[PDB]
């Protein structure tokens, strides 16, 4: 806590169910390393019975900002 | 005169469909999002959820409102 970790993020890929909608996050990755970090989470479910997916900062367009 | 308006009404309807059906094949085998975009064939795709709705809103209205008038009448 000091910058911004997981406090409000849209999705922008167009495949991901809650795509353009902004729900809440959690333990976003630490290290330099990989390409699929970030958990996100929101109320609304989706086409599977369980929906709580991980997208990745190449993108999260949050966008402003 | 009455088995000749229709073989030209069947067909004609029969077309239209096929018309509408080779312009949903363009979008898959051919078509090319990077080569068409901001471009008015796009936007047509892009601003699509409305397009079916302000279409479906015609039917549902044109639905029960014809059907009030015709049972009521019966």
């Amino acid at each position: 806590i000091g910058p911004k970790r997981g406090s409000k993020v849209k999705i922008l890929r167009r495949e991901s169910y809650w795509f353009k909608n902004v729900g809440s996050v959690v333990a976003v990755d630490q290290d330099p390393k990989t390409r699929y970090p970030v958990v996100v989470r929101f109320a609304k479910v989706n086409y599977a019975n369980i929906s709580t997916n991980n997208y990745a900062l190449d993108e999260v367009e949050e966008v402003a900002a | 005169q009455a088995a000749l308006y229709t073989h030209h009404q069947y067909i004609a309807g029969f077309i239209m469909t096929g018309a509408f059906a080779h312009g949903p094949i363009f979008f898959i085998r051919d078509y090319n999002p990077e080569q068409n975009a901001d471009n008015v064939l796009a936007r047509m795709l892009e601003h699509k959820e409305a397009i079916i709705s302000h279409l479906s809103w015609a039917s549902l209205f044109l639905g029960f409102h014809t059907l009030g008038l015709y049972v009521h009448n019966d």
Partner: protein, 138 residues
């Protein structure tokens, strides 16, 4: 057959399994271990017993002979084992090969997962017209 009678997996009759197309083409068969004399469920509708030998029942087609597991592992046992019989020999060594239990690591074998480009924006439709000179045979 009889003059050679080598059995293992008890049954009696049945209009279920194996018929003409398991000679003229391929064969498929499952084998296993077991503790003490126990009555089972069966593919093809029927039902019999066990004890041993090879415990080597032969089966029509291989989706059929792994379902000994989709229940025949809700009835104890590490070991169950199905191969591929021809009308003459091998290549396709079916539960043979390396390790076993689909969910471990020795090697990687095949699979891949990607095509050219990955799941990303294939709003990009079908590209080139199919023409004998640009890497789309995979």
């Amino acid at each position: 057959e009889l003059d050679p009678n080598t059995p293992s997996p008890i049954f009696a009759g049945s209009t279920g399994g194996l018929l003409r197309k398991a000679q003229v083409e391929e064969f498929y068969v499952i084998t296993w271990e077991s503790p003490k004399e126990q009555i089972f469920e069966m593919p093809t509708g029927g039902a019999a017993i066990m004890r041993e030998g090879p415990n080597l029942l032969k089966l029509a087609r291989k989706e059929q002979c792994l379902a000994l597991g989709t229940r025949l592992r809700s009835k104890y046992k590490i070991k169950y084992q199905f191969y591929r019989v021809f009308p003459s020999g091998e290549v396709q060594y079916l539960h043979p090969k390396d390790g076993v239990y689909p969910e471990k690591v020795n090697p990687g074998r095949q699979g891949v997962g990607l095509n050219m480009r990955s799941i990303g924006k294939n709003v990009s439709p079908i590209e080139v017209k199919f023409t004998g000179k640009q890497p789309y045979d995979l």
